[PDB]
RNA sequence: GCGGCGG
DNA sequence: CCGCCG
């Protein structure tokens, strides 16, 4: 199957909750510039012709790779709102 | 679909449509017919006549006609069963309320009355599983439950306080009634009802959401006494959740998660810092 | 309903081999739904036919037993219920060994041949005792037998 | 090649006309080849004499119907959209109450459709085919009450449909009931009105019923005679006249409700034999001498007291007996009918009788061909039993062009009461295939009829027995009504017989549908064959004997789908019919009379027969079949050959050498492979497309026409107004395409040229036009272009322009065109094929015969069928076949095994052993002897259980090949496959699924303009549905998104789809759905009535979807 | 007339046809109404469906998918990755250089794998009984027509092969993609929701050999 | 593995059971033709007869295969979960035997035959009737279109 | 709209 | 139920 998708399962209270983080996750991955991970040096995901998944595969496999570790954090009411898109445009090209 | 417990967002409604439609083409009373009975309260073919009252058993027999007599010191309930029907119960022993005093199905209104609700609801669900046993089929209880459920989700009024009597509405729409006329504001005026048992075909026809309504029932009645009465559908369910084309309040659409946030440490030192 | 301790057991055990009949089929049953490979074929039907000539056969032998009487009269006179008779035929000296029973209980297969209650051959030996003699109709003609005894 | 057939049963005389059915009814239909002299006065004539002595005084006669100069000829007909029909005129004479009587000779008042020597018909353009009908047999007959478990019912049904339906109840709370039309009367109450008095009637009815007690009933109407007729009409529900209207009385008289059948038989049979005696008249019609007769109405109730009472015979009618059902064929279809316009058309000629000047009328004024055209037309083109003709393969037609069916005119029989005539009856022995039927809904309703099954004078299916006096059987046959065919008692015919003598003492029979074992003194009538008991289409399996029914229908049913391989080959086990089929059906041209070849070109075979004749037959070359099918005739026969009468000249579409042939005989190996052959799949072996062994030519007809716009003229030019050259190349001849040209998916197939956006020409296209080229062609490009999917290479071209030679072109058409496009078919993963025993299966792989199942000896298998398929569905007759058809491999030979009658398990080992010595004997010689491989396989054989442990691998093997499994290597690893197993030569067709029709694929295209829906139609598809039951299926998973975008993204919202693609175009995220238009479409809907639906906030307040 | 037509009387065009005029009444009720629209639904862009075939090798995390189709079902996405390599200047050439098949770049075909990597589609099977009735997979691009699907699937869409056919689809959105990988995919639905019993449950001709 | 008209074998014992059961249906005869057992009883006793005899065939085929064949194709299919019903290969190696008429009231004659061996003409279009009615329901109740899984999502769609 | 047909 | 052809 997927990569520890059980351990995801158990980073959620419940299923649905993890979709959603996985695939917001993987938005501001594209959005606000593809280098916007926490693993890239060792271990970033990769593919098979030309090393070259390093830039641009799949968003969701990140984000899931990424979930997998204790970097990013998940909340009901975390970040206010708006400020989290003003700030993210700010430190990142 | 895995092995934990069920996670908050989850459409088991659906689920348990499926479940226990799926089975359906393989069942051909004896087959499909008894499981249409049974999610429509019926009268079924060979009805039973059931105990109301909960005494003891004493028969009289030989002539055109065969009588049950469940007696107690002050009444009997005289049951008359026809020279054609076959019963179980004998001369002597006990028979609580909504036993079965002849042979064969039972009729769910009676049944009801007599022992009472959690009786017809337990009896529906077993009924149920009955069939689909003796069909291979393996469903879980809790799908025939979350449907037989519905079909007692209303109830009608004998004591009035806010609105008038002769009234078919939801069981719990009168539990935030009964909750908040004693509770909150005084004057204990007790909203006396009856548990009403539905048939699965009229439990959807009456539901309560007019955006729902409009779809199978009349659309000209069901948007002119929604008209009237400013009607504010507060849209819980997925059918009337479709036509809006809005995200189902189930599945990942659950108000329990269709709000989550994900931050990476850097950015929440940066809206710290933004203090 | 009357039945002998002889005829209860045997229905008693019947209906438990059927029991296990109808467990069996079941399972089979639902294998077949479950496959929804070869549908269409004589599959279903089959299987579900099969599952219900078993669930009558167990409707019959449930009624029967719900509801039948015993008679303990193994030293009695006359023809009854349980009585196991014997007849002679005057001309050939052909002795012939008979039991007469209820419906339920009936069966040519049994050491003595077990013959219905309401059974032609049955209704004649109801009623009568040792050295009478009497007649039914028969294809070839009528043959009268003598009662010449009857055990238990 | 030699043939060996091993059949015991001596078939004693050969099946009949296959398509008799149809043929014959036509002919007995309208009796058009022989002269008015001739008796055989039904159909046609009867239905004019029926209806012609028309007397309004009016006096109108009939003298002789002619008809025989077919417009024009067969293909023609086709070719030109032109319905193939003869034209009919009759001799009639009007005369006249003064001196005069004036003939017009001639009033051509139709055109009625002819049959073709096949037996199909040519409506307009296409070839369609009358199927048979059943119903209950206007007759009468007693049924048992209802509900009441009590008494049983009296039923009276006559046809047409507008005649009453009679019956006869008795309820002995108070009446005695008659009912015509739902409302009960007192059955005594017409009969006083007929002349019945208390007095006899009660006397010689009631003999022996008190229940008699029931009609001496009126001691009060009872006394009043013809004041009773006057009585009865009281009795009709609605308010009209006491006197003459007795016209609801005349209509049960003797003209048009009571049934017109053939006085005699029709009715009359239903009537001397199952009750009362005779018939005065056709029906219980007599309106003569004021008083009336109805020798009727009193036996029916005669019989209804004999029933009741006694045992006067035990009256008890079992509906589906086949002795109350007839079969309308075509002749009896069409006629009917016909008929139905003869009277539309006497409807008019008597108002014109009145309108009358004087003498000066008679073939105008009486005449209107009006009535009699839509009438025929009508049928054969609208009524829902004519169809479009089956022609998969030729088998396929046939059988369609012989089935029964149930729906109809509706008064027959309708939809949702069946589950009693669904059931394969006791009668239905050899006049019904208990196979034929589809499965699915309609089951049991629509059947095929039996092999010597054979309609007779009134429709009951008579079938063959043969007369068998004392204990010796006789070469005399006689075909009984279902009826009378138990009476008798008949036996098998797998009887043993030593000639003409019976040969056990207990030997099997049937009683009445009873199986009970008869002896020899005992047999009146045995079976013909084995063969009557089936369909021909069944008649065809092998060793059906060995399959079970349910999948034998599979069986049965799959042949007709079955399609024209280029490389036909017949059965490596025949049945015994194929040739008869093949015949029977016209697929192959044979040879009239003995002769000699003279010229065998590839198109046109010339003989000279020796009776000093020579005849040119042309072969249809390469026709588009009905079903999209190859249909050429292959010479067979050389320049100047001896040919004996009724000699193949040609071959078929699907048969060869004579035979029948769909598909072709393959080596098989029957085991699993990885999974290619999971569940139903099929593994084939590249092997197989090298010889082009499974391939099929398809045919597809493209067409378009130049319409004529008010807004001018569509042409079909070369000229398309965007400009290109490159697509105008295969495009030579000025508007159509060159034959033989390649055309791919997009390419124009037509030119055609119609008027721009309606009305006015554009304001914003006018400057566009003139900034780059003012002088733009105005005209758009409206071009039959192949439509997704393929095309393939252009064959054949037809064009249809002004002067129409004998053309009809509908109205405001200008100029028609059709374009033929063909292609080749190889065998490819998505194709499936069946054998005739039921198993149906995909390709799964393709495998390289490199690393695929091979034997001992270089051969290769071809395709390997998973053994699991087998037990489930029980069909063991594949597997015999497979052994069979293993010695035919080495032994090379073809055989022929009857039904029941066939091959023999012992036989057949027989041959198997010859079969080694070919395999093997070769294998010793050539120079060695048996591998460590073959050795390895043969321990685990023993140990299995297989071979008798001690004797040579020599003798081993073969006993191994006896059980018909030979050892096999791997390919893949050239290892053995431990166990023996069993390969032969299968005989399997490619059927009517090609791929083809399986792989719309679709990112973008057209939408619906009243309806946002993505409908397609032209070079774009329609995207699947979604149905409520999917969208389910996704709720449950949680599927939010995949939901909404199912809803929106995909649909609806256009200009969200729009900023999705553009998004996805940009390698972005695609936006957020925000309203569907179907959301604020009903806002809005709500709005534009009464009601104000106002969305809402958190806090109940307004917010936008606008 | 224009809120409820036929109430009373039935107005209609000039003489010419004599249908009551879809009044507003009209358009929102009926069997094909607009109320009933919404819900019934309609037909998917993206989309496609093709002949069944059984497919051994193919992991339950996999499924086949024809290359063909594949180009067609994900031809947007594949655009965008012809001008991410030098096959395509811009858009528009990536189409043109589409339209015709004779011409299909070994480099297009090593493109359109690329936009597939992790992505995946979903399978329908004829009657949508239950949740299982559509599951999700990743596509292999594979020759020939027909689709190969994982056996061990077989069972939950009441699915043989005897010429059988599912339709397929596709998840645009990365929301919809996760969604349909995560709590859709197949390996990950392998309980049923009707009995706690497996429905990955081996098959036939597994067990047998095993 | 794989299949082979000889794989599907019949039990010895078959002619010994069938003639066991054969004599004991002359029992029954006599009997009747005595006047015993009335019209009725003596149907249900040869049913019973048969119903009885029919079963303990099945027992004996499968009996042959555990003991002789343990490794028979038709035989390890059925074992094994992979495909095969004991009541199917009754039908192959013993044999089917009792089919219904028209109505539902069973045949008083058994299929004597089993699939190995050639079917009978008769016995095959006795055997009709069944299949019929099977495919009969089928028809129904599958066009039945998961109505109730619609009725169902009725209700408990919210 | 009606016939046919696949699962 | 879903699908396709004429
Ligand atoms: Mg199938």
């Known amino acids: 199957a997927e990569p520890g998708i059980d351990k995801l399962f158990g980073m959620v209270d419940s299923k649905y909750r993890l979709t959603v983080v996985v695939a917001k996750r993987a938005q501001q991955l594209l959005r606000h510039g593809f280098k916007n991970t926490v693993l890239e040096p060792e271990e970033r995901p990769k593919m098979q012709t030309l090393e070259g998944l390093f830039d641009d595969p799949n968003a969701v496999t990140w984000a899931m790779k990424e979930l997998l570790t204790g970097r990013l954090v998940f909340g009901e009411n975390l970040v206010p709102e708006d400020r989290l898109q003003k700030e993210m445009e700010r430190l990142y090209p | 679909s895995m092995a934990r417990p069920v996670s908050i967002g989850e459409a088991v409604g659906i689920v348990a449509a499926q479940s226990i439609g799926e089975p359906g083409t393989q069942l051909t009373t004896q087959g499909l017919p008894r499981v249409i009975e049974l999610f429509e309260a019926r009268r079924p073919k060979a009805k039973a006549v059931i105990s109301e009252i909960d005494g003891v058993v004493r028969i009289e027999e030989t002539e055109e006609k065969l009588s049950v007599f469940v007696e107690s010191e002050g009444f009997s309930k005289e049951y008359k069963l026809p020279k054609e029907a076959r019963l179980l119960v004998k001369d002597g022993d006990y028979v609580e309320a909504g036993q079965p005093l002849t042979r064969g199905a039972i009729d769910p209104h009676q049944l009801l009355e007599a022992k009472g609700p959690e009786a017809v609801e337990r009896y529906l669900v077993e009924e149920i599983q009955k069939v689909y046993r003796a069909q291979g089929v393996k469903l879980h209880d809790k799908h025939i439950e979350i449907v037989v459920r519905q079909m007692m989700k209303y109830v009608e009024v004998t004591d009035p306080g806010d609105s008038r009597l002769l009234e078919g509405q939801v069981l719990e729409k009168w539990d935030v009634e009964a909750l908040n006329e004693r509770l909150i504001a005084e004057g204990k005026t007790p909203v006396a009802w009856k548990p009403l048992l539905m048939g699965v075909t009229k439990s959807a026809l009456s539901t309560k959401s007019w955006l729902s309504a409009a779809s199978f029932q009349n659309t000209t009645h069901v948007l002119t006494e929604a008209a009237i009465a400013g009607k504010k559908d507060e849209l819980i369910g997925l059918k009337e959740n479709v036509i809006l084309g809005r995200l189902i309040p189930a599945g990942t659409g659950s108000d329990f998660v269709r709000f989550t946030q994900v931050v990476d440490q850097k950015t929440l030192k940066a809206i710290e810092e933004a203090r | 309903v009357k039945l002998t301790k002889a005829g209860y057991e045997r229905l008693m055990q019947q209906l438990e081999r059927e029991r296990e009949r109808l467990q069996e089929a079941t399972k089979i049953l639902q294998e077949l739904m479950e496959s929804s490979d070869d549908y269409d074929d004589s599959g279903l039907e089959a299987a579900k036919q099969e599952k219900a000539r078993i669930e009558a056969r167990i409707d019959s032998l449930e009624d029967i037993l719900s509801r039948a009487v015993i008679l303990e009269e193994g030293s009695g006179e006359v023809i009854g219920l349980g009585s196991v008779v014997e007849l002679e035929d005057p001309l050939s000296g052909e002795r012939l060994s008979v039991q007469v029973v209820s419906p339920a209980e009936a069966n040519v297969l049994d050491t003595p041949m077990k013959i219905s209650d309401a059974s032609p051959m049955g209704k004649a030996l109801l009623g009568h005792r040792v050295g009478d003699v009497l007649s039914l109709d028969t294809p070839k003609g009528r043959r009268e037998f003598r009662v010449v005894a009857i055990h238990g | 090649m030699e043939i060996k057939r091993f059949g015991r049963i001596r078939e004693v005389i050969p099946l009949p006309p296959l398509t008799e059915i149809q043929v014959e009814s036509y002919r007995r239909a309208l009796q058009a080849d022989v002269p008015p002299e001739k008796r055989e006065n039904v159909g046609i004539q009867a239905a004019f004499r029926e209806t012609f002595p028309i007397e309004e005084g009016l006096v109108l006669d009939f003298l002789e119907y002619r008809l025989g100069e077919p417009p024009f000829p067969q293909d023609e007909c086709r070719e030109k959209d032109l319905t193939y029909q003869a034209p009919l005129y009759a001799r009639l004479q009007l005369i006249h109450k003064d001196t005069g009587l004036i003939k017009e000779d001639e009033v051509f008042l139709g055109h009625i459709p002819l049959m073709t020597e096949d037996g199909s018909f040519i409506i307009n353009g296409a070839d369609r085919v009358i199927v048979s009908q059943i119903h209950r047999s206007p007759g009468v007959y007693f049924t048992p009450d209802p509900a009441r478990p009590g008494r049983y019912i009296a039923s009276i049904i006559p046809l047409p449909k507008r005649g009453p339906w009679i019956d006869l109840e008795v309820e002995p709370n108070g009446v005695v009931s008659m009912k015509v039309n739902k409302r009960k009367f007192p059955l005594v109450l017409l009969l006083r009105v007929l002349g019945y008095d208390q007095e006899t009637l009660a006397r010689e009815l009631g003999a022996y019923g008190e229940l008699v007690q029931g009609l001496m009933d009126e001691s009060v109407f009872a006394m009043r005679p013809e004041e009773a007729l006057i009585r009865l009409f009281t009795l009709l529900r609605p308010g009209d006249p006491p006197k003459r209207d007795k016209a609801v009385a005349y209509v049960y008289g003797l003209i048009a409700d009571p049934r017109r059948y053939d006085l005699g038989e029709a009715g009359r049979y239903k009537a001397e034999e199952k009750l009362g005696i005779r018939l005065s008249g056709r029906t219980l019609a007599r309106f003569e001498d004021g008083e009336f007769k109805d020798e009727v109405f009193l036996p029916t109730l005669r019989y209804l007291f004999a029933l009741t009472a006694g045992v006067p015979g035990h009256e008890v009618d079992d509906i589906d007996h086949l002795g109350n059902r007839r079969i309308r064929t075509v002749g009896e279809l069409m006629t009917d009918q016909f008929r139905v316009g003869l009277a539309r058309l006497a409807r008019g000629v008597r108002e014109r009788m009145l309108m009358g000047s004087e003498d000066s009328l008679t073939p105008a004024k009486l005449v209107n061909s009006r009535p009699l055209e839509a009438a025929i037309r009508e049928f054969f083109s609208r009524s829902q039993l004519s169809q479009f003709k089956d022609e998969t393969n030729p088998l396929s037609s046939l059988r369609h062009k012989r089935r029964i069916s149930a729906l109809g005119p509706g008064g027959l029989t309708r939809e949702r009461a069946g589950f009693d005539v669904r059931d394969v009856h006791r009668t239905h022995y050899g006049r019904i295939c208990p196979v034929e039927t589809p499965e699915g809904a309609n089951i049991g309703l629509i059947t095929s009829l039996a092999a010597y099954a054979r309609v007779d004078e009134l429709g009951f299916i008579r079938t063959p027995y043969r007369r068998v006096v004392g204990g010796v059987v006789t070469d005399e046959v006689v075909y009984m009504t279902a009826t009378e065919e138990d009476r008798y008692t008949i036996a098998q015919a797998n009887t043993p017989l030593e000639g003409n003598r019976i040969a056990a003492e207990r030997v099997v029979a049937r009683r009445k549908g009873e199986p009970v074992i008869v002896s020899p003194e005992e047999v009146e009538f045995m079976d013909v064959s084995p063969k009557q008991v089936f369909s021909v289409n069944t008649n065809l399996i092998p060793f059906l004997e060995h399959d079970d029914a349910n999948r034998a229908l599979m069986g049965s049913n799959m042949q007709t789908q079955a399609v024209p391989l280029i490389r036909a080959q017949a059965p490596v086990v025949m049945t015994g019919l194929e040739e008869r089929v093949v015949r029977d059906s016209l697929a192959a041209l044979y040879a009239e009379e003995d002769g000699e070849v003279a010229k065998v070109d590839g198109n046109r075979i010339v003989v000279r027969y020796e009776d000093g004749r020579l005849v040119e037959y042309p072969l249809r070359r390469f026709y588009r079949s009905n079903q999209g099918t190859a249909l050429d005739q292959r010479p067979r026969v050389v320049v100047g050959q001896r040919v004996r009468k009724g000699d193949l000249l040609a071959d078929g579409p699907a048969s060869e050498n004579g035979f029948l042939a769909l598909g072709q005989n393959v080596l098989v190996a029957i085991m699993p492979f990885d999974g290619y052959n999971f569940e139903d799949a099929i593994v084939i072996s590249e092997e197989l497309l090298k010889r082009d062994f499974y391939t099929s030519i398809h045919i597809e007809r493209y067409e378009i026409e130049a319409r004529d716009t008010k807004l001018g003229p569509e042409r079909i030019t070369r000229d398309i107004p965007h400009l290109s050259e490159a697509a105008l190349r295969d495009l030579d001849e000025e508007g159509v395409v060159r034959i033989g040209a390649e055309v791919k998916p997009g390419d124009i197939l037509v030119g055609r040229t119609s008027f721009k956006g309606e009305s006015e020409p554009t304001p914003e296209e006018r400057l566009l036009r003139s900034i780059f080229g003012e002088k733009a062609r105005d005209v758009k490009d409206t071009s039959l272009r192949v439509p997704p999917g393929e095309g393939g290479i252009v064959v054949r071209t037809v064009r249809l322009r002004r002067g129409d030679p004998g053309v009809e072109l509908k109205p405001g058409v200008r100029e028609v065109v059709r374009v033929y496009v063909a292609q080749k078919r190889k065998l490819q993963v998505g194709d499936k094929l069946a054998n005739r025993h039921g198993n149906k299966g995909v390709v799964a792989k393709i495998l390289p015969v490199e690393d695929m199942p091979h034997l001992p000896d270089g051969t290769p298998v071809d395709v390997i069928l998973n053994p699991l398929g087998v037990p489930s569905r029980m069909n063991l007759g594949q597997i015999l076949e497979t052994h069979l058809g293993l010695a035919g491999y080495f032994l090379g030979q073809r055989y022929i095994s009857p039904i029941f009658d066939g091959a023999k398990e012992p036989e057949i080992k027989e041959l198997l052993a010859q079969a080694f010595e070919v395999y093997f004997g070769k294998r010793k010689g050539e120079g060695f002897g048996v591998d460590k491989r073959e050795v390895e396989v043969l321990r685990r054989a023993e140990k299995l259980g297989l071979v008798t442990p001690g004797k040579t691998p020599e003798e081993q093997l073969k006993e191994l090949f006896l059980q018909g499994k030979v050892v096999l290597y791997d390919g893949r690893t050239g290892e053995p496959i431990e166990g023996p197993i069993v390969v032969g030569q299968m005989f399997i067709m490619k059927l009517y699924h090609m791929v083809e029709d399986k792989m719309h694929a679709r990112s973008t295209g057209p939408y619906s303009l009243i309806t946002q829906q993505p409908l397609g139609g032209k070079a774009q598809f329609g995207g699947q549905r979604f149905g409520e039951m999917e969208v389910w299926a996704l709720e449950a998973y949680g599927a939010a998104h995949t939901l909404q975008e199912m809803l929106t993204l995909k649909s609806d919202d256009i200009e969200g789809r729009n900023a999705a693609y553009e998004a996805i175009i940009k390698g972005e995220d695609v936006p957020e759905p925000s309203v569907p238009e179907s959301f604020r479409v009903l806002v809005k809907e709500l709005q534009a009535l009464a009601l104000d639906v106002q969305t809402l906030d958190e806090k109940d307040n307004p917010v936008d979807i606008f | ?210 | 593995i794989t299949i082979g008209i000889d794989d599907a074998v019949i039990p010895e014992e078959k002619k010994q059971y069938l003639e066991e059961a054969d004599r004991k249906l002359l029992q029954i005869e006599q009997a009747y033709e005595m006047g015993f057992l009335t019209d009725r009883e003596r149907y249900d006793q040869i049913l019973q007869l048969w119903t009885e005899t029919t079963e303990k065939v099945t027992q004996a085929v499968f009996k042959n295969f555990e003991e002789n064949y343990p490794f028979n194709p038709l035989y390890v299919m059925a074992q094994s979960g992979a495909r095969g019903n004991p009541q199917q290969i009754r039908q192959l190696c013993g044999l089917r035997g009792l089919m219904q008429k028209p109505s539902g009231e069973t045949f008083e004659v058994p299929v004597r035959s089993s699939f190995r061996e050639g079917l009978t003409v008769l016995e095959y279009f006795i055997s009709s009737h069944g299949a019929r009615k099977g495919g009969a329901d089928t028809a129904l109740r599958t066009a039945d279109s998961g109505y109730l899984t619609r009725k169902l999502v009725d209700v408990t769609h919210e």
């Open chain 5, 1 to 210: 007339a224009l809120l409820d037509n036929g109430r009373r009387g039935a107005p209609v065009t000039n003489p010419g046809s004599d249908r009551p005029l879809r009044s507003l009444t009209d358009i929102l009720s009926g069997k094909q109404g607009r109320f009933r629209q919404n819900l019934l639904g309609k037909r998917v862009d993206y989309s496609g469906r093709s002949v069944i075939v059984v497919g051994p090798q193919l992991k339950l995390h996999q499924c086949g998918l024809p290359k063909r189709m594949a180009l067609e079902l994900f031809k947007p996405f594949l655009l965008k990755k012809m001008e991410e390599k030098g096959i395509a200047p811009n858009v528009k050439a990536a189409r043109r250089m589409l339209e015709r098949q004779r011409d299909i770049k070994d480099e297009v075909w090593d493109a359109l794998e690329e936009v597939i990597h992790g992505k995946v589609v979903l399978l329908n099977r004829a009657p949508t009984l239950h949740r299982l009735g559509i599951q999700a997979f990743q596509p292999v691009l594979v020759e020939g027509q027909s689709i190969q699907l994982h056996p061990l699937v077989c069972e939950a869409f009441n699915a043989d092969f005897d010429g059988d056919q599912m339709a397929v689809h596709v998840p645009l959105s990365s929301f919809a993609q996760a969604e349909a990988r995560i709590q859709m995919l197949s390996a990950h639905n392998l309980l049923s929701p009707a009995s706690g019993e497996p429905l990955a449950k081996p098959s036939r001709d597994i067990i047998l050999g095993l």
